[PDB]
Design a protein around this ligand. Structure first.
Ligand SMILES: *[C@@H]1O[C@H](CO)[C@@H](O)[C@H](O)[C@H]1NC(C)=O
Ligand SMILES: *[C@@H]1O[C@H](CO)[C@@H](O)[C@H](O)[C@H]1NC(C)=O
Ligand SMILES: *[C@@H]1O[C@H](CO)[C@@H](O)[C@H](O)[C@H]1NC(C)=O
Ligand SMILES: *[C@@H]1O[C@H](CO)[C@@H](O)[C@H](O)[C@H]1NC(C)=O
Ligand SMILES: *[C@@H]1O[C@H](CO)[C@@H](O)[C@H](O)[C@H]1NC(C)=O
Ligand SMILES: *[C@@H]1O[C@H](CO)[C@@H](O)[C@H](O)[C@H]1NC(C)=O
Lengths: 49, 273, 49
């Protein structure tokens, strides 16, 4: 539950070069794929079960 | 003193705040049309010994957001003023960019007479410029002070032929004032380079007033390298002070593998497009 | 109040409908007739508030 956007899946360290004004990452079909951790400035990648 | 030129592929920004990579996205918004024409206004200082009028700060319509580009090594440009009448009866913004701060004040400022101007206005022998700007007189009923970090910095220019092109875009939608910006360090000899360099979001503000006019708070105290001419209409010159108007177009953006925008195609220019 | 409250004002006459979340506080005489509404008040010249 990242800032109110729930989900389900495994989280892994990601190597995506975000930007300071960018928090979320999407793909085709418009589903979240990468998230920025709120407490620590880190990027995580979501993979389904 | 006014001329025209062509804006090849300049004036594209990130539509939203979502990361995308290696995909093509079709969007619709207020953009600057490809291969449109943009005016050149030049600030000319004539007869520094005398006090000849300049008329170097025209007022522009501001019809649905504007695009701004400037190529100056110095900090001669300082802020832009918006409003519908620029009088005491209406409310006007006062975005002002001093050395290390930005003060944004929405208010009904009584008058904006002129920037301070020395009679000699000669900078070939003197270089210091200390606390010589004051444009307004009063402020009765207003709020929304936004003292914050300076919007535009000053990148160092070395060995000549190295200037930074400063690009801004201002828009007003449902009472929200959005400002995007980008400072490209590489322009070299070309006046307006052809290529792609996306603009990142800078600021969003809840102003909530109508804007139908704007102009610049150009510090006319002194200005060098400002050739003058009597050209008008479809002509050519040199201004280092650009402006263009946005329109509601539909674009198709191509995102690189690293998340940046590499190419874009306008969907309303040519049959092939 | 029993005598009456007059501290609350509202605008009734203006040139055109205002866009969402936009505020107008100008106090100028509306031109509601062929007479030039240059004067402070008169027929065909209404106080919008
Ligand atoms: C509180 O949030 C900030 C946000 O940047 C973070 O740097 C800091 O580590 C957080 N504190 C704790 C105790 O987690
Ligand atoms: C736009 O600018 C061009 C020069 O680049 C000029 O030929 C044309 O007349 C201008 N006006 C248009 C296209 O409406
Ligand atoms: C710029 O303006 C701010 C607020 O008006 C002021 O605090 C600051 O000192 C100014 N910058 C300089 C270099 O004086
Ligand atoms: C500011 O408020 C006062 C009192 O409400 C009012 O008399 C004055 O007209 C207002 N200023 C303007 C520019 O309308
Ligand atoms: C993406 O960034 C890496 C990191 O340096 C770089 O090697 C690569 O060339 C970049 N990709 C593109 C398409 O420029
Ligand atoms: C003021 O805002 C209204 C809101 O729609 C707009 O119609 C008008 O053109 C703006 N300017 C003036 C001078 O009324």
């Amino acid at each position: 539950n990242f800032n109110g956007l729930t989900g389900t899946g495994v989280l892994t360290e990601s190597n995506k070069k975000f930007l300071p004004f960018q928090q979320f990452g999407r793909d085709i079909a418009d589903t979240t794929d990468a998230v920025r951790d709120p407490q620590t400035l880190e990027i995580l990648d979501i993979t389904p079960c | 003193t006014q001329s025209y030129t062509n804006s090849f592929t300049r004036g594209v920004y990130y539509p939203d705040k979502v990361f995308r990579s290696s995909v093509l996205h079709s969007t619709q918004d207020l953009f600057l049309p490809f291969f449109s024409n943009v005016t050149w206004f030049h600030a000319i200082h004539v007869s520094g010994t005398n006090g000849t009028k300049r008329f170097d700060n025209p007022v522009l319509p501001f019809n649905d957001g504007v695009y701004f580009a400037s190529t100056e090594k110095s900090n001669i440009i300082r802020g832009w003023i918006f409003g519908t009448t620029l009088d005491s009866k209406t409310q006007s913004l006062l975005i002002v960019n001093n050395a290390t701060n930005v003060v944004i004040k929405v208010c009904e400022f009584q008058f904006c007479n002129d920037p301070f101007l020395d009679v000699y206005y000669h900078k070939n022998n003197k270089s210091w410029m200390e606390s010589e700007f004051r444009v307004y007189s009063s402020a009765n009923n207003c709020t929304f002070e936004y003292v914050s970090q300076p919007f535009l910095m000053d990148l160092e220019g070395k060995q000549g032929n190295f200037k930074n092109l400063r690009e801004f875009v201002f828009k007003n939608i449902d009472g929200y004032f959005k400002i995007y910006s980008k400072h490209t360090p590489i322009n070299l000899g070309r006046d307006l380079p052809q290529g792609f360099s996306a603009l990142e979001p800078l600021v969003d503000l809840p102003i909530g007033i109508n804007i139908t006019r704007f102009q610049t708070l150009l510090a006319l105290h002194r200005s060098y390298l400002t050739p003058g001419d009597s050209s008008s209409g479809w002509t050519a010159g040199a201004a280092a002070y650009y402006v263009g108007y946005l329109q509601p177009r539909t674009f198709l953006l191509k995102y690189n593998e690293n998340g940046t925008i590499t190419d874009a195609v306008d969907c309303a220019l040519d049959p092939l497009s | 109040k029993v005598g009456g409250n007059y501290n609350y004002l509202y605008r009734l006459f203006r040139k055109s409908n205002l866009k969402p979340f936009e505020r107008d506080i100008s106090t100028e005489i509306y031109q509601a007739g062929n007479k030039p509404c240059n004067g402070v008040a008169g027929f065909n010249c209404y106080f919008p508030l």
